[PDB]
Ligand binder design. Structure first.
Ligand SMILES: NC(=O)c1ccc[n+]([C@@H]2O[C@H](COP(=O)([O-])OP(=O)(O)OC[C@H]3O[C@@H](n4cnc5c(N)ncnc54)[C@H](O)[C@@H]3O)[C@@H](O)[C@H]2O)c1
Ligand SMILES: NC(=O)c1ccc[n+]([C@@H]2O[C@H](COP(=O)([O-])OP(=O)(O)OC[C@H]3O[C@@H](n4cnc5c(N)ncnc54)[C@H](O)[C@@H]3O)[C@@H](O)[C@H]2O)c1
Ligand SMILES: O=C(O)C1=C[C@@H](O)[C@@H](O)[C@H](O)C1
Ligand SMILES: O=C(O)C1=C[C@@H](O)[C@@H](O)[C@H](O)C1
Ligand SMILES: O=C(O)C1=C[C@@H](O)[C@@H](O)[C@H](O)C1
Ligand SMILES: *[C@H]1C=C(C(=O)O)C[C@@H](O)[C@@H]1O
Ligand SMILES: *[C@H]1C=C(C(=O)O)C[C@@H](O)[C@@H]1O
Ligand SMILES: N[C@@H](CCC(=O)O)C(=O)O
Ligand SMILES: [Zn+2]
Ligand SMILES: [Zn+2]
Lengths: 554, 227, 213, 113
């Protein structure tokens, strides 16, 4: 099922599996004929993926045609003025002429550097993209943005230069390391957050399953990814199509293409300070959270959306803050002062003169404008700063109506007793806490109630099943949700024996050393079997699937 | 290796050199029990697969950065330029990560200059030892007199203040040690009965390296000094 | 008699006399509005031609608009990877953003180098050409070919990047040295030789009179 | 000044001034070059016997030190121009050699010119 995608009026993107070592070589020779093909990748990729391509290519190519190969060092440091010259001087050693066709094999570092070389070599030559990272498949290889870094910051010198072909071979994801996978999910989250709340919701559900598969130690790297092969295809096609359409509408970023720098206004500022040790997507994740928080401060984004975006980012094991312990560890405690971050944001390419422009989310899946919005320095400073200077004064004769977030005590109960009841309840002002999020999914898997949202997640529609629940074969992961584990321990005793005679509640490492002794003592006393699975008087706990408690005295 | 590494840590050595090539499970174990030992995270490139200009050292720098209290990267110089590129590289790394200092060298006689210019914890030889640890390493004295010839160790004037000091052996003493240690400094007489305004011209001069003070100025000098 | 010339569908070339110190400043501010204008020339040209333009420009420009100036060393050696970086790093010191409008004042060395900087700075910004040599007036400033030299040879790395305006002020020829005049006549001869035997014949007759003057 | 190589202007301690500030003497530059790999050390030899009481090593080693060179001169007693001798003479470390009794005549066949 080789699906193509249209960009700038032609279907030059192709997404298939195992095309590097057959289709790509033949398509180059037939659709982009030349005397000279130049294949450039990095040192990590070269000996694994280049020699077999050379074999295939040189077998197919005609007598007077040649394939040149070169590897540059991996990582951000290679998006540089030097590496550019190094490649160019090498090409000119072999008398590469204007008909040369360049093949960028690698991730976005290769894509950006080699593309920019292609853009400027003899004032422009043809090139193609063969993305090998998730990030590059869903973002970097599409759009024709090529650049290098300078000591000042990110991608400050470059060129718009479209590849003639973009060959997306999903098979490259098999050898991709776990960290680089998570890195690229930042760009996937970003694309969904600005464009599609339904894909966003899918990314939430798929998170647990994706990480598990990526971190798996299965018999092969391909069998490792097989359980989420359909999810990855959805993510790559979907994410590539959005970009392709956005790029078609606005190739040179006159307006709409601003939206693809969501989290990048602030993200690229952190990255100028923290690279090469901190990766791009990792910085984008941190930036997305700050640009969301900024929008919230400006009254353009609802708080629930910010929490929802942050939780998603975190559920893929990305950083939500620059203060993440992993960032300190990798960066050797490198500091990012606000004055330095603002100095980096002053050369952000969206800026209209001194005015800084930032993409503001209005909700999940929507943006405040169909471009970046002018934000005052004072507001950007407040979000990046650790401390607050409070100017005294409130308007004379003010009167306001303020609604704080819901109480988690009353909100956590509301979900439980709505789910157990007969009929349908709309819950306003519900605090979407970790207790709610995990209890909701728990009851879903117990077939205890149907859940649904309205008014962009501010109203929870609950149709309960009157206490008729079914014991889940699979254990119910709760994280470190205390109130959840407590409420669900008695709730899951109500479910009738369906697949198994019992049903098990597990969670975080911190949950496993958290007391539930007295409550279990009450259930045993009131005729409900329950055995501890690891530590005594704490989770995980296998609790019997009775038809409720015995009753009477408790 | 692990047992040898622990023998070092158990012995309370001030520095311990683990190579970044070692497997992760040992890098973790040695790092966790390091205590107050400073870790020198090292990598050597004797076959010359890496390059300063191109930035093929970065992956090792990035690794050494999170394991070591001190990074030690050693390559090979084929030509004099390879030392310039190293010096430039090191400078860029120290700018980016002030808090983790670096020992950066080129092996071979071509890379002798990189030993001179390294500055921080340069490994050296000594004539009394049977071999040199690496080929073409210089002694502390040699490097120090190399630094002197380029003015990285700027010469300084040292003085003896007081009288009578015509038959004082201090000049013989200190000038000999300067020569013996490879320093370019010079020690000289300055007879005077009082701590004059002309004396404090020498003492506050930027050429001033230090001075001995004898009779009758041991007490009268103190007001001219800051601390 | 200010005659304009059409290129790529618009009359963006203008050929007149004494436009540097009046028309050009005003046309930039009116047709290419920006927060930041960057005027780059070489050391031979700077103190003669830049300060008077700054006076005129800063008198006409509105409150929130600025003019930055910079001189690079003259001659072919400045069509280099280094000089490119030198200019770019300097621009970024002053937080030049994407709206920046670059003014290439000089001959083909300036035209090619500064044009290529313009072509790649933040993936492309607006620039204009103010040719000051005969060569640049008749060849280099037109066409949008920008490049640098590498040790391998001529103009091997560069970009096609068209200037929004090409201001040809014939008055710059007044201070141009004799050698640079003769240099540019090569490109004039060339153009005639491939395209027009009648202009060619005129160049033959005019030769004695041109050199003398 | 050290790295220049060709016609480097130098000072000398016996002159009243330095022509330019911070110029080094020929000897200083030459020993600077020696400390970096740029003047590679060389072996110099005295061939013949008896050479136990020969002053040549004192002579040449002193001049090496005095001129700033890193070379070294040493004894090598031998009655004949052996195959072991020409190992030293054809070595790339070879800087030159003095030859005395009884090898002044027997050495010539081993030399090219
Ligand atoms: N052009 C654009 O519009 C665009 C969009 C997003 C990001 N970017 C840029 O992309 C860069 C990030 O690119 P990246 O995240 O791909 O990093 P990258 O290109 O360095 O690749 C990540 C690492 O994984 C290795 N790798 C790649 N594919 C592999 C495979 N199949 N198996 C094993 N290892 C593999 C690489 O050698 C490298 O070490 C940033 O500089 C960013 O600015 C550009
Ligand atoms: N892009 C193109 O289509 C194109 C066409 C032809 C030539 N070129 C390139 O242009 C370059 C040659 O350009 P050039 O001949 O203008 O050299 P140039 O720009 O260096 O100028 C020549 C010299 O005259 C000086 N000068 C310029 N204007 C002056 C004035 N009004 N008064 C006094 N001095 C002045 C300059 O300082 C310089 O020293 C070459 O590198 C060539 O490759 C490009
Ligand atoms: O019953 C509840 O909802 C709670 C009671 C208190 O212990 C709180 O501290 C706890 O967080 C929740
Ligand atoms: O004459 C001398 O050399 C000296 C004599 C003592 O007073 C010492 O204390 C002094 O430092 C040096
Ligand atoms: O004893 C010596 O050192 C020498 C004796 C003579 O033969 C000299 O000619 C020779 O060069 C050195
Ligand atoms: C590190 C580096 C050395 C060198 O190359 O000079 C000597 C070696 O013993 C040290 O471990
Ligand atoms: C040239 C250069 C000198 C220097 O600067 O070392 C000395 C001067 O006398 C020579 O003419
Ligand atoms: N994700 C892209 C945004 C630019 C674009 O594709 O428009 C980047 O990191 O540069
Ligand atoms: Zn990005
Ligand atoms: Zn020409």
């Amino acid at each position: 099922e080789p699906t193509r995608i249209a960009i700038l009026g032609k279907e030059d993107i192709i997404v298939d599996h195992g095309i590097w070592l057959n289709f790509v070589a033949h398509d180059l020779l037939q659709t982009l004929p030349s005397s000279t093909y130049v294949l450039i990748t990095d040192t990590n990729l070269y000996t694994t993926y280049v020699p077999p391509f050379q074999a295939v290519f040189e077998a197919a190519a005609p007598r007077d045609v040649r394939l040149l190969t070169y590897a540059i060092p991996p990582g951000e440091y290679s998006k540089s003025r030097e590496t550019k010259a190094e490649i160019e001087d090498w090409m000119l050693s072999h008398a590469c002429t204007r008909d040369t066709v360049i093949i960028a094999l690698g991730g976005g570092v290769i894509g950006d550097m080699i593309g920019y070389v292609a853009a400027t070599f003899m004032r422009g030559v043809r090139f193609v993209q063969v993305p090998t990272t998730l990030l590059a498949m869903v973002d970097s290889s599409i759009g024709g943005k090529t650049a290098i870094d300078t000591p000042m910051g990110k991608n400050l010198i470059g060129a718009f230069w479209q590849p003639r072909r973009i060959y997306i071979d999903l098979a490259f994801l098999e050898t991709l390391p776990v960290r680089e996978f998570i890195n690229g999910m930042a760009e996937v989250i970003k694309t969904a957050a600005i464009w599609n709340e339904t894909e966003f919701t899918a990314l939430e559900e798929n998170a647990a399953a994706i990480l598990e598969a990526v971190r798996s130690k299965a018999s092969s790297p391909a069998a490792r990814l097989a359980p989420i092969r359909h999810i990855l295809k959805r993510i790559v096609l979907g994410s590539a199509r959005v970009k392709a359409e956005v790029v078609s509408a606005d190739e040179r970023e006159g307006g709409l293409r601003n939206l693809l720098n969501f989290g990048h206004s602030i993200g690229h500022a952190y990255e100028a300070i923290l690279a090469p040790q901190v990766l791009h997507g990792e910085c984008v994740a941190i930036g997305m959270v700050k640009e969301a928080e900024l929008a919230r401060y400006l009254g353009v984004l609802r708080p629930s959306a910010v929490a929802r975006l942050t939780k998603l980012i975190a559920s893929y094991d990305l950083p939500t803050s620059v203060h993440d312990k992993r960032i300190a560890k990798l960066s050797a405690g490198k500091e990012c002062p606000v004055d330095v971050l603002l100095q980096k944001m002053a050369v952000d390419k969206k800026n209209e003169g001194r005015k800084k422009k930032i993409v503001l989310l209005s909700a999940i899946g929507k943006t405040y404008e169909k471009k970046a919005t002018v934000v005052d320095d004072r507001a950007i400073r407040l979000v990046l700063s650790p401390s607050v200077r409070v100017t005294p004064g409130v308007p004379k004769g003010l009167s306001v109506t303020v609604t704080p977030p819901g109480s988690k005590s009353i909100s956590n109960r509301a979900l439980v007793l709505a789910a157990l009841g007969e009929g349908t309840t709309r819950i306003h002002g519900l605090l979407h806490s970790d207790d709610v999020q995990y209890m909701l999914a728990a009851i879903e898997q117990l077939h205890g109630a149907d859940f649904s949202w309205e008014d962009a997640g501010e109203i929870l529609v609950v149709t309960g099943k009157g206490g008729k629940l079914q014991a889940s074969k699979e254990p119910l992961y709760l994280g470190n949700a205390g109130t959840a584990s407590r409420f669900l321990t008695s709730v899951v005793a109500l479910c009738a024996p369906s697949a198994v005679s019992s049903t098990v509640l597990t969670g975080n490492a911190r949950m496993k050393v958290r007391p539930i002794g007295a409550l279990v003592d009450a259930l045993r006393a009131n005729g409900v079997g329950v055995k501890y699975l690891e530590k005594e008087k704490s989770l995980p706990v296998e609790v019997d699937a009775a038809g409720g408690f015995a009753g009477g005295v408790i | 290796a692990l047992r040898l590494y622990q023998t070092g840590l158990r012995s309370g050595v001030e520095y311990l050199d683990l190579e970044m090539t070692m497997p992760d499970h040992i890098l973790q174990a040695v790092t966790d029990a390091k205590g107050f030992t400073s870790i020198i995270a090292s990598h050597h490139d004797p076959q010359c697969k890496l390059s300063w200009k191109s930035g093929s050292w970065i992956p090792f720098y990035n690794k050494a950065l999170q394991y070591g209290d001190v990074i030690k990267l050693v390559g090979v110089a084929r030509e004099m330029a390879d030392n310039f590129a190293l010096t430039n590289f090191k400078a860029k790394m120290l700018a980016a990560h002030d808090n983790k200092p670096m020992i950066a060298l080129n092996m071979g006689t071509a890379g002798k200059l990189s030993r001179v210019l390294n500055g921080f914890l340069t490994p050296v030889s000594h004539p009394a030892l049977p071999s040199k640890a690496a080929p073409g390493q210089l002694s502390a004295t040699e490097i120090r007199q190399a630094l002197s010839l380029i003015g990285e160790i700027e010469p300084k004037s040292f003085y003896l203040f007081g009288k009578p000091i015509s038959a004082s052996r201090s000049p013989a003493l200190h000038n000999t040690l300067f020569y013996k240690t490879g320093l370019p400094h010079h020690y000289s007489r300055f007879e005077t009965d009082e701590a004059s305004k002309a004396l404090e011209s020498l003492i506050r001069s930027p050429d001033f390296g230090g001075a001995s003070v004898t009779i009758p100025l041991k007490l009268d000098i103190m007001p001219l000094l800051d601390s």
